[PDB]
Design an enzyme around this catalytic site. Sequence first.
Site, PDB file in Angstrom:
ATOM      1  N   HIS A  41       0.799  -1.211   0.000  1.00 43.75           N
ATOM      2  CA  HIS A  41       0.000   0.000   0.000  1.00 43.75           C
ATOM      3  C   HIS A  41       0.849   1.287   0.000  1.00 43.75           C
ATOM      4  CE1 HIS A  41       0.463  -0.348   4.500  1.00 43.75           C
ATOM      5  NE2 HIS A  41       0.622   0.954   4.342  1.00 43.75           N
ATOM      6  N   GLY A 141       3.030   6.107   9.247  1.00 42.61           N
ATOM      7  CA  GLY A 141       4.378   5.980   8.753  1.00 42.61           C
ATOM      8  C   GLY A 141       5.149   4.795   9.304  1.00 42.61           C
ATOM      9  N   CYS A 143       4.421   1.629   8.928  1.00 41.20           N
ATOM     10  CA  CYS A 143       4.322   0.403   8.154  1.00 41.20           C
ATOM     11  C   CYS A 143       5.660   0.053   7.518  1.00 41.20           C
ATOM     12  CB  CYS A 143       3.230   0.515   7.096  1.00 41.20           C
ATOM     13  SG  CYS A 143       1.640   0.447   7.882  1.00 41.20           S
TER      14      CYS A 143
END
Lengths: 297, 302
Positions: A41, A141, A143
């Site tokens: 993503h 942020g 991930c």
Amino acid sequence: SGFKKLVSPSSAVEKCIVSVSYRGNNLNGLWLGDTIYCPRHVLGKFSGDQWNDVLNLANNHEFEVTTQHGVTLNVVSRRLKGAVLILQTAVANAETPKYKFIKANCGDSFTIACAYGGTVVGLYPVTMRSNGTIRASFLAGACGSVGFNIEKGVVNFFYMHHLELPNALHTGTDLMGEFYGGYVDEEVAQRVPPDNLVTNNIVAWLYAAIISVKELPKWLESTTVSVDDYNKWAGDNGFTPFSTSTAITKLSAITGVDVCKLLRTIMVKNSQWGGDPILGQYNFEDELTPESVFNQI
Amino acid sequence: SGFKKLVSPSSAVEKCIVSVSYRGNNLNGLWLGDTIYCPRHVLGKFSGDQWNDVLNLANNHEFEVTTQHGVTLNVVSRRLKGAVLILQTAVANAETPKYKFIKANCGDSFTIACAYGGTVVGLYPVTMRSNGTIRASFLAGACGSVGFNIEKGVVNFFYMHHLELPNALHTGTDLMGEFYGGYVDEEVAQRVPPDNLVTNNIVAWLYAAIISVKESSFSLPKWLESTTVSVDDYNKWAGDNGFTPFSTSTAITKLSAITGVDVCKLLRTIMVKNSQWGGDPILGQYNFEDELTPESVFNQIG
Ligand SMILES: *C(=N)[C@H](C[C@@H]1CCNC1=O)NC(=O)[C@H](CC(C)C)NC(=O)[C@@H](NS(C)(=O)=O)C(C)(C)C
Ligand SMILES: *C(=N)[C@H](C[C@@H]1CCNC1=O)NC(=O)[C@H](CC(C)C)NC(=O)[C@@H](NS(C)(=O)=O)C(C)(C)C
């Protein structure tokens, strides 16, 4: 003496965490060899089969990938594996450690390297819960932050962080892109099966309490319950099944308390804890493993 | 979302931990510049004025110092500073970070780099307790392990591990060689004052819980008291009930303003719950968590 939830040292993982940005989407990646692993993503919030066509339309030259040294890396190829985006770099990471990609089982504990902007800012331990979540600490942020431990000089990678479900629950994939618990990287409603308390870890913690008190506890029951009878009860009361292990066998022998005594304690304390605390607590601790308790003896 | 007890990343410290051996005593040292800090009892188990003569009696060539790389360092000089032995090396550590030596106060929390044989094997957080101990996890050979955090690219060193008191209580020195809590590096019985629950950290934990209920039920927590208690009045109660005094701080002020909840409502909640907790949990528990600091809770909001 003393029992703590240990974190693995981070130097080998810090050398592999890079920042990955795409058109304003900022996350983290894991750089091993000439391969960067990061959540797909980073491309945007797509779903289903839109991903494969988003991939072929993406532009390698627009992946902004920087290292902790400040070096810009150049993506030469891209592909998807599950929900993980795999980016090939022009040059290999010469600081790649020995590693393995391993799926974490329920009750397994490991270290989260929490990262923002490609820099690990802090670490903490977590346990893989029965429903494929972890109880972690993550902001926007984070991930691409990874879960790992180190065993005999090898870095085991268990987890890459993707998303946060309600009630402060977190989940992601293994390093092969398969989501724990069958969740999906879509901002939609997703059923979360009830969390079952991890019996084997509770047993470890009860043994740690007994070892601590050696200096028998009043909360420790005197009657016993068979493993089958406890496991029947466990399936009806929100606990995982008790499963024998080398570490649990050692803890029982070292303390001199049959584990079936601890299982009865779990049943009685879960029904009514009363006023007696176990290691200062009136609730079970289930994120300390039998192996870690034994290593601290 | 979510709140954890955080550990600082360890790469900067791993590059500074070395093994220090002397006549069968195998401990750890902290190598900064051309200087190694380690516990003086690597020289053996002495007391009082004995240490200075033992220092003159030791010789540098008998110190066996090796790095994580397997490189053997050579000691060129030695001195005692409090209960810390300071060894000068012929060459300096080229991987020395920016650092400060800072004395941890009660409730200050930091990361233990737990080391054996000169190698960090694991990390965990600890809080400096009101009696100058920490609740850690240490075995034989762990001495010279260090407590630290990283702030603004600077490694603060707070602690070097020396000994274990009864009931799994650990203590040691700052990096200036002064023992926390007035303990001494001898294997005799020692006076250990009460361990008081750290109010400022409980306040932080309660703010963390308010934040969690706000982001899970869009309301104030069921257990949060409606009345306030004065700081002076709470601190009088704390002295007679095993708690540290409350003291304002920038992090606590920010948490009060972010949540909009007067900190004196949290102090009254502490008094009410400590006398009779009841059946409602706070973040899953029925006992006060006091090792999560206001600064850490603030950093975990953003
Ligand atoms: C990764 N950088 C980020 C980490 C989240 C943000 C807050 N805490 C975390 O752990 N992940 C996301 O923002 C994902 C992205 C999608 C495409 C999967 N979105 C969420 O986690 C979302 N939760 S959800 C799946 O809708 O229930 C948030 C942003 C509303 C928490
Ligand atoms: C240093 N390596 C070691 C760490 C201890 C050992 C077990 N757990 C720890 O934290 N420190 C010692 O062995 C010290 C040495 C003296 C000379 C300062 N001795 C002890 O800690 C002693 N406890 S005491 C001071 O008598 O109350 C033990 C070894 C009996 C725990």
